[PDB]
Symmetry: C2
Subunit: 65 residues, 2 copies
Amino acid sequence: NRQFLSLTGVSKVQSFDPKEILLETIQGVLSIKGEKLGIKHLDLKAGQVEVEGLIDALVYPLEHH
Amino acid sequence: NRQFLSLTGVSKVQSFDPKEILLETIQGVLSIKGEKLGIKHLDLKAGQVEVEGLIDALVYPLEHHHHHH
């Protein structure tokens, strides 16, 4: 059930481990939680990030949850 | 400020409007809210979707009562 998620407009990877990825973007922080997560690609110049893994939840902007 | 979001494991587009897209995926529904949103690509064989626009929020899994029933 592995999924690949790609997003632009990302300004920074705040933190990453296989259970959670925190990304900083336009309206705040995006939280991706799950298991076996991994950063597949990152290009801050282009504001591009690619993530893969077993996704349980996606929350954005994290400050409103 | 326009963002591009692509996701795999998508089985169905529940509903689409330039301000909200509801997609059915593995654990339930993913809600993408914002403005001038558009679905640029949808391939159900591959389970792939590509969305673009101004994203204000992403909630997954969405609350059952907020699905488009």
